[PDB]
Amino acid sequence: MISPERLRVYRFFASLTDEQLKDIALISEEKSFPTGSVIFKENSKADNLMLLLEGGVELFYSSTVCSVVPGAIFGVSSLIKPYHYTSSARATKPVRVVDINGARLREMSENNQALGQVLMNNVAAAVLARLH
């Protein structure tokens, strides 16, 4: 699915080495969700990190927490202990995402200090940017 020079245009991925992008692409898949679908649920194991390519996502409690627009990541608890979603996510328009295997990212972060450092930095930057 994921043809990873395309990933570089997005902030979260723009700083990664070529090998790192190929590696992340291998564990990623393009996915679509229809308007109103619940993409993931609060309290579930965070096994998917997503990059929004098209459409709109609301992070909410089943009160809205946050609205996501294309180019931004969500499912960030896939890389933040204790790795359970702190909110649910739903599509507010037809949605396409890059769906990244969070269990794999966690392994790779543990075994590859360099990738672990950049991923955590970038997650932190992404969540910081939600209030800007």
Added chain:
Amino acid sequence: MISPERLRVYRFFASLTDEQLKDIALISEEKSFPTGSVIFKENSKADNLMLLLEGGVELFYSSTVCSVVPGAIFGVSSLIKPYHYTSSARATKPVRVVDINGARLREMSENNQALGQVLMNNVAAAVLARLH
């Protein structure tokens, strides 16, 4: 200043080992700021990570971005590349903080993979919690 069993009651520090807390205490100092003081400025090198002990802080552009209450951290770009404050901070009431040397945290993060991992996780969790 910082008598570091006291640090454990706060979320950011509660998970650290005893050695890690002693180490962070060594590079920390209790500081006070009066109402209306600008604690740090947008675009400055992020050389101070702060834990709010008492009072109130507004993160703003010179529009408000975020309000901080006791028990929460701010100055998070001290650990997020490229390490420049993304907003200014001002006291909205009389403020006391734990002021942590960000340059030292960065060194320690680089030289001690274990501390680096926990600090980045905890920074990410802290910024995530701002929308909850």
